[PDB]
Amino acid sequence: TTLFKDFTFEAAHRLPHVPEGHKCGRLHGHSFMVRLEITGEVDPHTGWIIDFAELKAAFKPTYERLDHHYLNDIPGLENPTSEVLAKWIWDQVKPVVPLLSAVMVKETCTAGCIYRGE
Amino acid sequence: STTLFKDFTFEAAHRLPHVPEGHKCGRLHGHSFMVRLEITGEVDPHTGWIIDFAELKAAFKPTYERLDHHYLNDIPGLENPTSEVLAKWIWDQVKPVVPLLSAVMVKETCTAGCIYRGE
Amino acid sequence: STTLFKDFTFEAAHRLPHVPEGHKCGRLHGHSFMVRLEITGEVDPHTGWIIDFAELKAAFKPTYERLDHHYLNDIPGLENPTSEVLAKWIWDQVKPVVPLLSAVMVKETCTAGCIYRGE
Amino acid sequence: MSTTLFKDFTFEAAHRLPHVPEGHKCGRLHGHSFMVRLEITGEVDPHTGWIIDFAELKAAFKPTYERLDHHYLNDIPGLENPTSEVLAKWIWDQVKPVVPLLSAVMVKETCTAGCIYRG
Amino acid sequence: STTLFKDFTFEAAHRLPHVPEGHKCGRLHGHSFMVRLEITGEVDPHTGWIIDFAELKAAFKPTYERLDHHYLNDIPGLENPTSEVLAKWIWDQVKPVVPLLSAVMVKETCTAGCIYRG
Amino acid sequence: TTLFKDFTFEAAHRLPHVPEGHKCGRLHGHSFMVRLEITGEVDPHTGWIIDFAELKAAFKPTYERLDHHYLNDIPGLENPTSEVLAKWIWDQVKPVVPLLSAVMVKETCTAGCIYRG
Ligand SMILES: [Zn+2]
Ligand SMILES: [Zn+2]
Ligand SMILES: [Zn+2]
Ligand SMILES: [Zn+2]
Ligand SMILES: [Zn+2]
Ligand SMILES: [Zn+2]
Numbered sequence A: 001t002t003l004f005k006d007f008t009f010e011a012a013h014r015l016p017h018v019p020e021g022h023k024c025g026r027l028h029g030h031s032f033m034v035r036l037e038i039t040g041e042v043d044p045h046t047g048w049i050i051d052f053a054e055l056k057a058a059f060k061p062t063y064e065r066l067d068h069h070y071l072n073d074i075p076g077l078e079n080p081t082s083e084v085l086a087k088w089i090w091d092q093v094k095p096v097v098p099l100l101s102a103v104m105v106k107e108t109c110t111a112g113c114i115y116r117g118e
Numbered sequence B, C: 001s002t003t004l005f006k007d008f009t010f011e012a013a014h015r016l017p018h019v020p021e022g023h024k025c026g027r028l029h030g031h032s033f034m035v036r037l038e039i040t041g042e043v044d045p046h047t048g049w050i051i052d053f054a055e056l057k058a059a060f061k062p063t064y065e066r067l068d069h070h071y072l073n074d075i076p077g078l079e080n081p082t083s084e085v086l087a088k089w090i091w092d093q094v095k096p097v098v099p100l101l102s103a104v105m106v107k108e109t110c111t112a113g114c115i116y117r118g119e
Numbered sequence D: 001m002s003t004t005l006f007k008d009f010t011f012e013a014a015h016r017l018p019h020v021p022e023g024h025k026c027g028r029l030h031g032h033s034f035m036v037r038l039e040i041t042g043e044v045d046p047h048t049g050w051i052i053d054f055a056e057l058k059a060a061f062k063p064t065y066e067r068l069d070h071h072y073l074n075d076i077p078g079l080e081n082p083t084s085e086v087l088a089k090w091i092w093d094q095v096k097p098v099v100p101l102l103s104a105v106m107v108k109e110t111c112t113a114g115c116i117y118r119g
Numbered sequence E: 001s002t003t004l005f006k007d008f009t010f011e012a013a014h015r016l017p018h019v020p021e022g023h024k025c026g027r028l029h030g031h032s033f034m035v036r037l038e039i040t041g042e043v044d045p046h047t048g049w050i051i052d053f054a055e056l057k058a059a060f061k062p063t064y065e066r067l068d069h070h071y072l073n074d075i076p077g078l079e080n081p082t083s084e085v086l087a088k089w090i091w092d093q094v095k096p097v098v099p100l101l102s103a104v105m106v107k108e109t110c111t112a113g114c115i116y117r118g
Numbered sequence F: 001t002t003l004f005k006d007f008t009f010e011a012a013h014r015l016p017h018v019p020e021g022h023k024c025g026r027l028h029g030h031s032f033m034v035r036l037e038i039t040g041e042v043d044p045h046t047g048w049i050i051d052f053a054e055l056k057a058a059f060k061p062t063y064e065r066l067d068h069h070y071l072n073d074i075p076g077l078e079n080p081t082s083e084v085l086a087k088w089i090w091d092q093v094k095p096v097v098p099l100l101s102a103v104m105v106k107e108t109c110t111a112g113c114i115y116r117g
Helices: A052-066 A082-093 B053-067 B083-097 C053-067 C083-094 D054-068 D084-095 E053-067 E083-094 F052-066 F082-093
Strands: A002-013 A028-039 A100-106 A111-115 B002-014 B029-040 B101-109 B112-116 C002-014 C029-040 C101-109 C112-116 D003-015 D030-041 D102-110 D113-117 E002-014 E029-040 E101-109 E112-116 F002-013 F028-039 F100-108 F111-115
Touching: A002 A052, A002 D102, A028 A052, A028 A082, A052 A082, A082 A100, A082 A111, B002 B053, B002 C101, B002 F082, B029 B053, B029 B083, B053 B083, B083 B101, B083 B112, B101 C002, C002 C053, C002 D084, C029 C053, C029 C083, C053 C083, C083 C101, C083 C112, C083 E002, D003 D054, D003 E083, D030 D054, D030 D084, D054 D084, D084 D102, D084 D113, E002 E053, E029 E053, E029 E083, E053 E083, E083 E101, E083 E112, E101 F002, F002 F052, F028 F052, F028 F082, F052 F082, F082 F100, F082 F111
Parallel strands: A028 D030, B029 C029, E029 F028
Antiparallel strands: A002 A028, A002 B112, A002 D030, A028 A100, A028 D003, A100 A111, A111 F002, B002 B029, B002 C029, B002 F111, B029 B101, B029 C002, B101 B112, C002 C029, C002 D113, C029 C101, C101 C112, C112 E002, D003 D030, D003 E112, D030 D102, D102 D113, E002 E029, E002 F028, E029 E101, E029 F002, E101 E112, F002 F028, F028 F100, F100 F111
């Protein structure tokens, strides 16, 4: 059994290692989506792995740093690609949500990335 | 491998009986639930599919109609109708009539869900 | 003219008391209700908006909390909690605090809803 | 008239709001996947069966689209206060001269928040 | 006023016969069409609605079944099956059976549609 | 680490081997969605597995054959089910994008197929 919860955040970023003309090298932004996936045993009394409210509360500090912010200013996100961001979120969240099994980030509606700790 | 999926939505009430005193989910409420039935297997050389979606619909229909426009807590097995219990419950009803079923996902909201895989 | 809109979703149970005896909507059930609040007015040349989304949210919050994770039929005025009655009821609750309110949309499902404009 | 055609475009951009109080999160540098709906109202041509060709709407909007997409809005003349409202009006002022039948511009900063400008 | 609406999707093929040679829309293709029917009228104080969605569905069903899993150009009146032509045709089929019909919207794609008010 | 990109195309098709009168046997169409998934090592400098634009560029010829077309006329798609289409897309794209790890095709909003080689 796997549980997941989606969050949207509104942020700016730019990619520093792309060619001079490359549109993503310009200052821009996205309505980012991030899905946190957790895997574990469901408790027979509560009937869940954990409460969505506790997941929200555990993610909030990391969420607050991402939302309505410029990502490049955050340590670790100097090259804030989808891939880099997905792993960065794992690194922030995994220590406080041990059951975390994947982080998906969507940069746009049609484009995204899934990281699992590999 | 090849996997096929079909999504269904149903409109239902429920309440969580085993949450702390104030918890909002402990009150009588409801959701537009989404369920995805995932099936895995060999695709037939002639039909070009694993199963006919109409077979899947027909097999799921009795379970679907018990869930849709209903109060889930009245259904035996769903006395604690969390997304996790519900996904397993749907698996337990559907697996016997859809042997190739490989997962059941339920979403209570647009942003929150559960996947169950028979383990 | 310029119109601003903001969507909220709430998770609630309801049942319709005045449908024929077998009607599925007469059963206790629920929805992920979406409400859109429309605001029509002059754009302030300093702020560059008609109203801050954050202020609209703050103004709506009390009404939102009465609806979300609740059973609608127990709320005074929502004894017949159709989309149309709900849209008017929301208007009546919100208009005093949001005088520029120009419409309330309520969607019960992804494919079904109504719009009230104050008449 | 009777018939209104519309076409949606999405662009990825940064902005910040200069005239919000110090704390306000929209005053910080951020961004959105902006959506813009262009609405055209006019007589449907008996021969083509349309009001306008979407290809011509694309080409007429392209120069304005390219200025918005993957850009920082505040650097664009006229968008020093790049609210939804200001943006929708600004788009209207750029596009209306090249698309005379333009009847409305909608911009959504998020999937739940936007506005409509009608001239 | 109060306006009610209901959305349906149908899966159909079409092609546009009066576009220049080579135009992609002149080729045989298809869409997941979406049609919204809007109804405007007084809310009945007993039912608390303008009409039952079931009455609307049943009124539209015959037209829906002509459109769904069909090739539109073979339908009389849809020889030039643009969004605009299709919306008006639907209106012309449905208005006699749904007198309170106030608008028909058709979307060919997620990003493109039209609204007809006869 | 897995990267994905979605594309939509507007196409007609019909299923030739379904029973008499079956709706899917009639000429019809869909707004098809296709998701290309690629799995691989992220480069330490670029910070990606590949540029979305190279993937877009690699799929374009195949995309061009699918979009605003009748699928049955394309060799390999004479029985254009979701399952057949997903495998066909994989066979076109895999040789050009060797890190490709899955292809999902959604025929409708609520129905689709995932193929993994
Ligand atoms: Zn970007
Ligand atoms: Zn619930
Ligand atoms: Zn209901
Ligand atoms: Zn903003
Ligand atoms: Zn078309
Ligand atoms: Zn089909």
